[PDB]
Amino acid sequence: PQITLWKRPLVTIKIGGQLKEALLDTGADDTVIEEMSLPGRWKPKMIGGIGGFIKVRQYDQIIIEIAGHKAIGTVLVGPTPANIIGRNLLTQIGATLNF
Amino acid sequence: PQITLWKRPLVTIKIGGQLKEALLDTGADDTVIEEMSLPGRWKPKMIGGIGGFIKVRQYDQIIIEIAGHKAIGTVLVGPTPANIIGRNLLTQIGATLNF
Ligand SMILES: CC(C)(C)NC(=O)[C@@H]1C[C@@H]2CCCC[C@@H]2CN1C[C@@H](O)[C@H](Cc1ccccc1)NC(=O)[C@H](CC(N)=O)NC(=O)c1ccc2ccccc2n1
Ligand SMILES: [Cl-]
Ligand SMILES: [Cl-]
Ligand code: NA
């Protein structure tokens, strides 16, 4: 698809068998999701944004569908105000910015 | 142009007579620039993101040049860790996300 920016670029994602809403975000290096359960071991990460830093759980090689496109990669879980799809997974679905 | 997402999508902007670097950011509602002087009146605002809220000054009807394309809109000025071009100005240059 071709997505304009007059409204927030919200899409449906599927993770752990569950549907959720998430933001397509060219300004984010990483993908970060609100609290949920994921399989396997996790590693620590500190991430920074506009108001300061938060601590999150890093899960590698997680299966995730984004607007009907399949990806497998790194997902961060923690106290984010919103679900965000960053450049690590935008590149797996072949997304570009055009003007 | 077509911009890929392997690296941060950084471009040159002209604002207030000054040349700066800024991030093309589909996940931001607003345009936010590091401390600088701008002409005309302003009012205070609180804006949020990943680590909480920051206090900014809101300037309306500011002209800006973004990678060679002229636009006008609201610009917020304050202690942001990075300069960001948000959706209020990306719409004006015709930017879209494609996959
Ligand atoms: C997500 C993470 C990997 C941590 N990356 C980032 O946070 C980087 C950090 C960079 C350096 C600091 C300056 C911002 C840039 C760009 N950001 C991405 C960037 O796209 C970021 C993503 C985001 C969206 C929603 C909620 C939180 C965070 N947006 C923002 O920071 C913008 C700023 C603004 N216009 O007010 N926030 C919002 O547009 C926004 C929308 C709804 C909200 C609801 C509740 C609380 C906060 C909310 N913030
Ligand atoms: Cl920890
Ligand atoms: Cl505006
Ligand atoms: Na003004």
Side-chain angles (χ1 to χ4, degrees), chain A residues 49-88:
Chain A
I50 212 154
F53 294 78
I54 67 170
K55 299 203 129 156
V56 297
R57 305 194 301 281
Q58 177 176 329
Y59 295 88
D60 296 322
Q61 211 164 153
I62 298 292
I63 302 168
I64 178 172
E65 196 183 53
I66 301 157
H69 299 247
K70 299 189 261 186
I72 311 177
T74 300
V75 173
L76 312 178
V77 180
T80 181
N83 300 319
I84 299 160
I85 308 305
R87 294 185 298 95
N88 69 309

Side-chain angles (χ1 to χ4, degrees), chain A residues 8 23 25 27 48-50 81 84, chain B residues 25 27-30 47-50 80-81:
Chain A
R8 292 177 180 157
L23 189 64
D25 190 0
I50 212 154
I84 299 160
Chain B
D25 191 353
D29 296 343
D30 308 313
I47 65 173
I50 271 260
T80 180

Side-chain angles (χ1 to χ4, degrees), chain A residues 1-3 5-9 23-27 29 49-51 69 80-81 87 91 93-99, chain B residues 1-3 5-9 23-27 29 49-51 54 69 87 91-99:
Chain A
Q2 179 163 286
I3 305 175
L5 299 166
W6 304 99
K7 62 195 209 197
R8 292 177 180 157
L23 189 64
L24 302 180
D25 190 0
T26 60
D29 297 341
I50 212 154
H69 299 247
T80 181
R87 294 185 298 95
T91 57
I93 74 176
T96 54
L97 279 169
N98 293 265
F99 56 93
Chain B
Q2 173 169 101
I3 303 182
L5 297 169
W6 305 113
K7 317 275 159 162
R8 294 175 180 158
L23 187 70
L24 303 178
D25 191 353
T26 61
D29 296 343
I50 271 260
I54 65 167
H69 293 69
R87 292 186 301 98
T91 61
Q92 301 298 283
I93 72 171
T96 56
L97 281 158
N98 286 267
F99 60 101

Side-chain angles (χ1 to χ4, degrees), chain B residues 1-50:
Chain B
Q2 173 169 101
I3 303 182
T4 60
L5 297 169
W6 305 113
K7 317 275 159 162
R8 294 175 180 158
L10 298 164
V11 299
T12 302
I13 73 166
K14 197 171 161 187
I15 179 167
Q18 303 185 29
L19 289 173
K20 294 181 173 299
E21 295 302 307
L23 187 70
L24 303 178
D25 191 353
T26 61
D29 296 343
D30 308 313
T31 294
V32 195
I33 305 294
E34 61 200 340
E35 284 293 352
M36 66 176 300
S37 181
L38 292 172
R41 241 284 99 146
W42 63 270
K43 62 184 174 188
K45 194 185 185 79
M46 290 275 269
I47 65 173
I50 271 260

